Structures are given as C-alpha cells and as structure tokens.
Amino acid sequence: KPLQRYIPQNGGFTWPGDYLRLEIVEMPKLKSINIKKTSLKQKINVQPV
Amino acid sequence: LDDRRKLEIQYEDYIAEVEIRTEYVDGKSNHQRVVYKFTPHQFRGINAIDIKGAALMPASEVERICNECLPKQPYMVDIAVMDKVRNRIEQWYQSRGLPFCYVGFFDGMDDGILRANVTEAKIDNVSVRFVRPKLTGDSELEYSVY
Amino acid sequence: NQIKTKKLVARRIKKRYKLLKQMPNQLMYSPTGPLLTEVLPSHYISVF
C-alpha cells in the first residue's frame, strides 16, 4: 500500500484555526416525534455506543 | 472501593461504569461530600417501540405496554427500555399462567425501531418411562428401568 | 491458594459469558490486556 506521510500542510478554504463545520456527512437524523413504522432509508449501522 | 465493586457487580447489565468521588465541603472542617456518578450503556438512537408476535395477547395490553415504555429522548437511549418491555411481557404471560411464553429477542435496531418478537410454544411430544427403586443401605438409591 | 481464587475472579470479570452472548447486538465487550500507554506517536498507524 502507498505509504502515508505525516507532513503538516498550510491553510485552505478556511483560516488555520477552524475546520469545515458545515460539511455534509451521510448519517440519518432522528425526529423526536415517534414514527411507528417508517424505514430510515439508511441504517444507523453500529447501534450501541 | 467495596461500594464501587458491589455496585458494579449487582447492577452489571444496566450500568457501564460507576465513579465515586469526594469533595471537601470545607478545607479546615475535614468533612467531605461523596458523589456517585453512573454511566449506563446506551443506544445511539431509539425512536419507537413495537411488539411482534404474541398472538394470544389482546391489542389492549399491546397498546398499554407500548405506552408504558415510551422513551423521552430519541438520542443516547439507555438499554433499560428493552429490558423493561421484556419484563412487562414476561410478567403478563406468567400472570396469565403460561410459563413458556417468552420474549424471543429484539430486532429493528437498524431502523431505530425496538421491536420485541415474542415466540410462543406448544406441546409436541409426550413420553413415558417406568422405573423401580431398589432397597439398600448405601444411602444412594439405584433405579431399574422397565 | 489465593492465586486460584484470584484467577477465578479474573475469569468472572473478563469472560462473563452473559455479556459476550449478546455483545454484538446491544453491547461492546472485547478481550484486551491492561492499558500500557496513553499517548503514541501519530505514525503508528503505518504498522497496519
């Protein structure tokens, strides 16, 4: 496998302090109102913490 | 240490870790306050609860048990709700007099639907055995099968 | 004599058959030794 190299790199798309907070990650969001029978269309995978 | 070990042992399933800490109420008085913090096992998300199977159970009890165990928050739900549902179902069936009607297991965790699949049982095979006990002073009875 | 009882207690603690029977679906219970360190060089992942 190609070897990973750990060299720090300089800022891009943001100032050095922060990271990309508003990046979209595919993970379902749960509504507080109970849904009796409705598939989430995306399994939450590993359920336990 | 003894309290922590005893609390961990006696409530192993629900609680993942119990921490005991001491904080001085006053520095000179040497009197202290003891704080117990409990962290139980949790699920990343549980939204609704359902019971499948249990043909003998009327719909009224099905609605009642569902209303009894409604989670307050849909995030970081502890693992006590499934045990509570199982306990309620087992208690109802045992009160009815059937001991072998038990909750099979739980499914629907992928979709965040805690569903308890109750599996019932029926009498299948009946057999008979004939035995005869002997008499002796060995204090351990022996049997002859006929 | 105490060593055998200590081993029995260790077996109770670390290989509780109740937990590992239902571990994958609603728990997390894995066999590991004692914790040896708290921090590591960031390039240890290359070992994998």
Side-chain angles (χ1 to χ4, degrees), chain B residues 1-16 18 20-36 38-50 53-56 58-59 62 65-66 68-71 73-83 85-87 90-109 112 114-121 126 128 130-137 139 141 143-146:
Chain B
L1 296 176
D2 293 332
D3 270 348
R4 185 190 66 86
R5 176 63 75 181
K6 177 176 56 185
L7 289 181
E8 278 186 354
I9 291 302
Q10 197 173 12
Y11 303 135
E12 182 185 24
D13 297 333
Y14 322 95
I15 304 176
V18 47
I20 310 174
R21 59 184 182 94
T22 59
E23 53 181 5
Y24 285 88
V25 181
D26 292 317
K28 58 176 183 58
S29 67
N30 200 16
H31 299 345
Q32 309 179 210
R33 180 193 299 103
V34 183
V35 181
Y36 298 78
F38 299 89
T39 62
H41 298 91
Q42 298 172 341
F43 292 115
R44 284 182 175 84
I46 293 296
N47 200 18
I49 57 176
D50 186 14
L56 213 63
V62 164
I65 64 102
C66 181
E68 181 180 358
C69 304
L70 291 175
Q73 181 180 358
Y75 290 109
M76 312 303 291
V77 189
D78 57 332
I79 70 174
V81 284
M82 52 185 304
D83 282 327
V85 174
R86 180 190 302 179
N87 174 35
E90 300 298 337
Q91 179 180 359
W92 189 90
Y93 268 114
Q94 289 177 9
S95 181
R96 260 53 185 175
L98 308 180
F100 301 105
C101 296
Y102 67 100
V103 177
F105 47 91
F106 296 82
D107 286 328
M109 303 301 180
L114 189 150
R115 173 173 58 257
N117 43 265
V118 183
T119 65
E120 298 184 5
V126 183
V128 289
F130 310 93
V131 295
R132 161 185 168 270
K134 291 183 292 296
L135 278 170
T136 181
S139 180
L141 297 179
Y143 291 93
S144 300
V145 46
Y146 301 109

Side-chain angles (χ1 to χ4, degrees), chain A residues 21-28 30 32 39:
Chain A
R21 308 176 185 177
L22 276 71
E23 186 179 4
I24 292 183
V25 53
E26 199 169 12
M27 184 167 292
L30 264 57
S32 298
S39 297

